[PDB]
From a paper:
We describe a focused, protective antibody response, abundant in memory and serum repertoires, to a conserved region at the influenza virus hemagglutinin (HA) head interface. Known broadly protective antibodies engage sites on the major virion surface protein, influenza virus hemagglutinin (HA). These include the receptor-binding site (RBS) on the “head” of an HA subunit (1–5), sites on the HA “stem”, and a recently identified site at the interface between two heads of an HA trimer. Stem and head interface antibodies realize their full protective potential through Fc-dependent pathways that lead to the killing of infected cells rather than by blocking viral entry.
Among circulating strains of most HA serotypes, Arg229 is maintained by strong purifying selection. Some laboratory-passaged viruses have a substitution for this residue. Most head interface antibodies contact Arg229 and fail to bind 229 mutants. We determined the HA trimer structure of laboratory-propagated A/Bangkok/01/1979(H3N2) with its acquired Arg229Gly substitution. The mutation led to a distortion of the 220 loop, the major contact site for all head interface antibodies. Despite the substitution and rearrangement, S1V2-51 bound the A/Bangkok/01/1979(H3N2) isolate. Constraints on the 220 loop, which forms one side of the receptor-binding pocket, are likely to limit potential pathways of antibody escape.
Numbering used by the authors:
A (entry chain A): 8 to 327, 332 to 502
B (entry chain B): 7 to 326, 332 to 502
C (entry chain C): 4 to 325, 332 to 502
Write the structure that this text describes.
């Protein structure tokens, strides 16, 4: 009745969350947030990126001029989305090194075509075929010019076209492979043509082959698509005596944030900086498990489906007349106004208060590292291809091995970051408890003794005002020193 | 005659300490440490669990084609296929454009399962053989290749199609003959120059043979260039040649699997090891390894370091008639039954005990971090090539830059990890010692004083039964308080 | 009776400075410390040091124009180098030519680091040699590439050439050869007779065959003609065969292939007289720091490229800048302390004093340098790498060469950022720990003769002259000497 008891404790919660640290695989903390994004709406947000839905068309069909893809002429995009249902309805074709041409056009992000009048005098022009119906007429690829005998002759063609602008020119052209020797001489007179497109830097010579194409959409013939880039100050030189599929001009090559993605996800009305083939995902978290193929500012792909960062101290439930005990035994599920506080027992009764300074001190540290964790947007656009449909060998072996190495290294960084941050999270919250106890230990000077359970036995009368003067940093030990030393030192 | 006792707090020491690295120190001595970089091999490739296929005198490509001394490899399968350096070609001279890619894709397929398809081939004679490819006592040829050639002194143009109506990728292996002389060209194919064209809906491959180019190999100044074509389901194979065709007899079934290939001369043995290197099989108990960067299976990660030692014990401090001394001075080499404990000196003499609770808290934290360091498995199969015999240029520069960049990043992660863990290992063990010392301090309340050297001066008769009460937390400070406050406070 | 007998005060503190430096930790984005150091090298003199690496200045010559033998590049014959520096002012003044896969030929010649050419005498009987053109003037005569031979009519005939050359010695042979693409059919028949030629260069491992095209080359320096350049490597025990009827540009021998530290770099930085292990296109940079933001293109032992332009490593304690009563480390630091990081301030009957503790000052300094030595020890010596800046639009191979380097920098930028944050959080902790250890060291040898005032100071309950204070500082303090006097003052008897 001539003493009081002051106890030091920290809060606790009835649920709790398990996290990983350097030490333990499962340790229970009060709060925790998720770092790995693993869900998506399924809708690609048409904002803030220019999304161009390919619909029934691939990038190459819209490039060449397949008539059902004529809506895509001169179109521009940030992310061009190819669908699975896309399909070819013009003349049969192949593209040697298909992936590269699809890659560089996607990076340019524009189908802006500029027409150029080549001379083509001595040949007839704009040949078509019934397999490429535009409307009801027999047409052909809109950006390709198909040359063929004039007055039953077909001379050697020497045609040039300089680049005097300050900007790169992509010329798309082709070589015909007739079904029979009849079709060869009917269109080109000579038994075998030769195609040679040249610059000051490059030269592409293609010998056409006769009847070397399988049956596609009514025809055993086809055209091989090639491309040539003409830098400023350079010149295009076409040289053919047969089977030339001429360019009607060039596509302008730009450099920008543009790329291409394969996805069947619907385009919706929303805003999201990050885009996956699964759909748009938020970029609030630092890591994501949705898909390694991403466009825009996105979390980093990791193998882990979950990585929980601890945002609170160890949870130690009380699991146990009225008596009070300190942090040594357990935490306090009854303290909701703070993380650290004082439970007292004195002459006027018993009470709880929380300590604002130490609680904010811990929170400021906890939420400072959250800001350090989330400050990395890391914005990426046109990357490498990460899923493949044909067997290719050496090059995709390296293209896979690079991406797979990238993911293992970031999965390592993520696992270690969460483990270090949490081991530091638990330690800093332990430190703020101990500092508050030692701060209270030293105010009391010689007026109290440490009971061992995180509580002080104060050897003098200590009304609610005196407890307050301990909580508040205003306890004067000299006022009570005599009364305390009397009760302490009895024989 | 004496009214006091001395209770000292200490930790253990060992005579054969081990040096490790920390964030601070380059060399600090601890009691125990374990190695993390695997650096030794038995020199044998364990045949379990993975299916090892010893290539013996055969390369994968010779076994693919059907070099008669490799006929045993027909239709064989593998998980890892081992090419010996003694392997050698004994059939018709040949070369393969993009040899690496064909070797890579066949290796990752993991099977030589062949399916005979009967092409029509009317108008030519099949199964041509040579003396430079003796199968048994007979002039023969590659077992999977059909060397077509004149019939009735006529060689008509060949139009053949074989559709892939399966649901699974087909691998056709074909070739092109390069005769030694003009006389040999016309005797075998009538025409002065041939033309081999293999076509899918997606690709075309047209080859025009050169005459006399090949150097003398095993009796012949001739040879065949091998090319490959993959026909996807629903697509169709179309062969077309007016000369020099080396035809396929069918397709190799393509599979997706854990299979790969490795260049090694290590002997195959009877044992079991998850990890395989060209040096031989290595244990994957350690997270890192310095044996070889070429690995197959669940393997440790390759690092540049040849030794990384993880501290698994506290700082080693030798203790070095003499008053008993605590941990502030030095450890205790005599302590064997624990890492922490008490030495006391009272009226019954001296004694030494160990504290289980503080020792397991240190041991369980050390085992907890080991289990997190060992938990990584890392199972990789078909990767990229990492050693090269020919000078190539752009592509292997990237293949070398990728692997060399990988090895540096993991060597950093391994070095930093050891330094972080050991600093934490030392810090956590020093913490347990401080926690046991403070736990004892507060049991003694006002009955003792901290002598400074990590020892308490207890101011009352404290027989062995009283020490044991302090040791297992049953000391009642009130029982000895009046006596102790008497002895402490004399003037 | 209040404080009747005299007492003394002994305070524990740490130094502070008026010009602190902000650094990053695991907790805080900006926390002020006393001393810091920069880890990211972000400046260069702009000069490529001619030491300790053998630098070769291309001047008006590219590596391939020196390779082929462009007459204004005759000084570069048989020259060697560690780093060869192509200049952007260079140019080709011989016969017009293109090189399919020019990047690979440039790369392997640079990696060999030598243009050591070994003349071999092929058997060109039946053809005439040393074909020259006026677009390639050497001296005042019409000439041609010094290391190429241009074969052409022999008595108005030019038959099928069968030519062989064995590789009888050790180590590889690089053969450089080409194919002429004549401007007109007249030039085709006036030089080669046959309508169309055919160049075939073969080994046991490979074929290379080329069917030349007429009039396929644009007008360059007076000629609508050109030569396509091709190369073949002949391993030991293998053999070179040249089979051609027309349009053959024959080699005069091979370049000896070596393997070593050699490479090539594109830079307009002037060469200077100085020594530096690291070379960038921007110039040479010091390799003391572990990271650099100058250029991702480097040669030699260089700091690693990172996106960050500054990463400051804390190399001192937390800076906390600082009634006649002294106070301790709990409140603030002591700007007055110059001779040490930690120390004591006291007030007693002889006055007020101050002294620095050398033991705990070194304990922090030695731990800080234990960090620096682990941080600064990373040499990282890389030589011939991959190309990292491109001028032509290529596609698939280009995307991977960019994605690999782009992924590398992001991974080291992470490692750099995390390392600075960990190293600084550990610095602040250890410097705080040494303060608390020095205070507890004093607390324990004072025994029952003082009380902790709570501000990092002790109220010592006995007369304590300067020699008394010095004993506490030297640790020679004996508490029993003062124990009776102190207990009498602490507790009233
Ligand atoms: C577009 O190309 C045509 C055709 O020439 C091509 O050009 C080169 C680059 C290669 O691609 C070749 O393979 C092609 O042949 C050019 O037509 C020629 O233009 C010139 C100059 O204008 C004409 O020369 C004139 O000829 C007059 C007499 O020609 C008449 O008589 C001759 C016989 O004497 C007869 O062969 C010809 O067919 C005519 O009937 C002459 O009085 C005048 O002074 C001048 O020399 C030449 O005749 C044209 N050829 C043809 C077949 O029409 C174009 O010039 C070119 N245009 C552009 C803008 O470049
Ligand atoms: C080389 O052989 C192939 C294989 O037969 C030839 O292709 C075939 O060409 C015929 C031409 O009529 C095709 O017939 C058509 O088939 C469609 C299928 O639905 C049918 O609807 C039509 O009424 C018509 O009968 C046949 O399908 C086609 N088959 C294949 C596999 O391509 C090819 O023509 C031959 N080469 C030459 C130069 O003739
Ligand atoms: C020094 O530290 C190492 C820590 O790696 C100690 O080695 C470890 O010792 C324990 C028990 O002695 C071994 O546990 C065993 O685990 C296997 C399963 O892996 C189980 O089958 C056994 O029954 C046993 O429980 C552990 O494997 C072993 N680890 C290593 C890497 O050696 C070592 O004992 C310490 N030295 C001293 C002197 O304490
Ligand atoms: C493999 O394909 C060959 C083609 O080289 C098949 O033989 C040819 O089959 C066609 C169609 O049945 C025959 O064409 C017809 O010939 C008669 C002969 O008078 C003619 O009157 C018809 O108007 C038509 O043109 C062709 O003669 C025939 N050639 C030969 C040499 O047999 C052959 O059937 C296929 N192999 C098989 C089915 O085993
Ligand atoms: C182009 O010239 C080359 C080189 O002279 C010719 O190849 C050579 O052909 C002869 C043919 O008898 C080879 O001789 C053989 O040597 C082996 C090994 O000593 C021996 O066992 C045989 O009995 C025979 O004597 C010679 O080795 C071979 N040399 C090379 C480098 O290939 C080639 O035939 C010529 N081609 C034309 C179209 O002129
Ligand atoms: C913790 O320390 C206390 C104090 O040393 C231990 O309590 C008492 O320890 C003594 C000696 O070990 C026990 O004496 C024994 O009692 C049995 C039963 O009467 C008797 O047959 C033996 O000859 C001996 O005298 C005593 O029983 C025990 N106290 C009680 C209530 O059992 C205690 O055992 C220590 N606990 C641990 C886990 O070490
Ligand atoms: C603030 O921190 C920096 C970096 O820790 C300190 O710079 C270091 O200063 C020492 C000299 O006290 C340098 O060591 C000396 O190096 C020279 C050769 O340069 C040698 O002749 C001496 O015998 C001595 O070893 C050290 O290199 C230097 N480090 C750096 C990165 O500059 C600086 O002194 C600190 N300032 C204060 C006021 O503490
Ligand atoms: C194929 O057509 C191209 C272009 O139509 C021809 O290139 C042209 O070749 C003539 C050669 O006399 C060049 O004339 C020269 O021009 C320079 C610069 O103006 C001048 O200084 C000379 O005195 C001479 O007149 C002309 O510039 C050049 N044009 C282009 C665009 O390159 C080429 O010759 C034709 N093919 C054949 C086999 O003739
Ligand atoms: C070393 O040399 C390289 C060039 O070889 C320098 O890169 C160039 O840096 C300048 C900026 O000083 C870039 O110009 C402008 O940069 C701003 C960003 O500050 C950007 O927003 C503008 O659009 C513009 O690009 C320039 O583009 C860049 N590249 C080239 C080829 O000039 C590099 O800065 C030099 N090293 C250091 C440390 O500065
Ligand atoms: C506390 O420790 C310090 C450091 O050891 C003591 O200061 C040093 O004290 C020694 C004597 O113990 C001085 O040595 C003397 O130097 C004079 C120079 O005039 C010489 O004539 C003497 O023969 C003797 O060698 C030393 O100079 C002095 N340090 C400095 C920088 O002067 C201090 O005395 C110790 N105090 C206590 C109370 O233990
Ligand atoms: C595993 O094999 C590799 C390569 O066969 C060994 O590395 C070679 O070591 C020799 C030492 O005499 C060097 O001369 C070679 O240059 C090394 N090759 C490479 C590619 O580095 C390696 O030492 C072997 N490992 C073990 C444990 O025996
Ligand atoms: C634990 O339960 C409380 C009950 O109010 C709840 O507010 C809290 O969100 C739960 N924990 C987490 C991590 O959500
Ligand atoms: C995203 O799509 C890929 C491929 O279609 C699929 O494997 C993966 O499970 C999907 N993930 C989510 C979260 O929908
Ligand atoms: C972030 O700081 C705010 C400021 O009070 C706080 O509400 C929140 O709980 C903090 N986040 C944590 C502690 O995870
Ligand atoms: C608490 O402290 C504040 C200043 O920090 C003071 O104004 C107030 O009076 C104090 N409360 C009591 C009860 O002393
Ligand atoms: C390999 O070839 C050599 C020489 O012909 C022979 O002695 C050896 O037995 C062969 N080994 C196998 C496994 O075929
Ligand atoms: C090689 O030289 C000899 C002698 O000069 C000559 O007889 C022979 O024809 C030459 N071989 C050729 C030109 O292939
Ligand atoms: C590291 O040691 C040097 C030389 O002894 C010293 O000058 C420097 O101050 C030390 N480091 C720091 C951060 O003080």
């Amino acid at each position: 009745n001539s003493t009081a008891t002051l106890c030091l404790g920290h809060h606790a919660v009835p649920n709790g969350t398990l996290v990983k640290t350097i030490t333990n695989d499962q340790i229970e903390v009060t709060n925790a947030t998720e770092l790995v994004q693993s869900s998506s709406t399924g809708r690609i947000c048409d904002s803030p990126h220019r999304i161009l839905d390919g619909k029934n068309c691939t990038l190459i069909d819209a490039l060449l001029g397949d008539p059902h893809c004529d809506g895509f002429q001169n179109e521009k995009w940030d992310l061009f989305v190819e669908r699975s249902k896309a399909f070819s309805n013009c003349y049969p074709y192949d593209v040697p090194d298909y992936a590269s041409l699809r890659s560089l056009v996607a990076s340019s992000g524009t189908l802006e075509f500029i027409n150029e009048g080549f001379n083509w005098t001595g040949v007839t022009q704009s040949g078509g075929s019934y397999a490429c119906k535009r409307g009801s007429d027999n047409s052909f690829f809109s950006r390709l010019n198909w040359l063929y005998e004039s007055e039953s002759k077909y001379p050697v063609l020497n045609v040039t076209m300089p680049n005097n602008g300050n900007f790169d020119k992509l010329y798309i052209w082709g070589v015909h492979h007739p079904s029979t020797d009849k079709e060869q001489t009917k269109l080109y007179v000579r038994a075998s043509g030769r195609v040679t497109v040249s610059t000051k830097r490059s030269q592409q010579t293609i010998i056409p082959n006769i009847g070397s194409r399988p049956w596609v959409r009514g025809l055993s013939s086809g055209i091989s698509i090639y491309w040539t880039i003409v830098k400023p100050g350079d010149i295009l030189l076409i040289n053919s005596n047969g089977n030339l599929i001429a360019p009607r001009g060039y596509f302008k090559i730009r450099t920008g944030k543009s790329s291409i993605m394969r996805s069947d996800a619907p385009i919706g009305t929303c805003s999201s900086e990050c885009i996956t083939p699964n759909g748009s995902i938020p970029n609030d978290k630092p890591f994501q498990n949705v898909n390694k193929i991403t466009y825009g500012a996105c979390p980093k792909y990791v193998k882990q489906n979950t990585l929980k960062l601890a945002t609170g101290m160890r949870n130690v439930p009380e699991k146990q007349f009225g008596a009070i005990a300190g942090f040594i035994e357990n935490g306090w599920e009854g303290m909701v106004d703070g993380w650290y506080g004082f439970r007292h027992q004195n002459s006027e009764g018993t009470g709880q208060a929380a300590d604002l300074k130490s609680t904010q001190a811990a929170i400021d540290q906890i939420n400072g590292k959250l800001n350090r964790v989330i400050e990395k947007t890391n914005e990426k656009f046109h990357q490498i291809e990460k899923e493949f449909s044909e067997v290719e060998g050496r090059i995709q072996d390296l293209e896979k091995y690079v991406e797979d190495t990238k993911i293992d290294l970031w999965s390592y960084n993520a696992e270690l970051l969460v483990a270090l941050e949490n081991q530091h999270t638990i330690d800093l919250t332990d430190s703020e408890m101990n500092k508050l106890f030692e701060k209270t230990r030293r105010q009391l000077r010689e007026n109290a003794e440490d009971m061992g359970n995180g509580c002080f036995k104060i050897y003098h009368k200590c009304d609610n005002a005196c407890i307050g003067s301990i909580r508040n940093g205003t306890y004067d030990h000299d006022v009570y020193r005599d009364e305390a030393l009397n009760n302490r030192f009895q024989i």
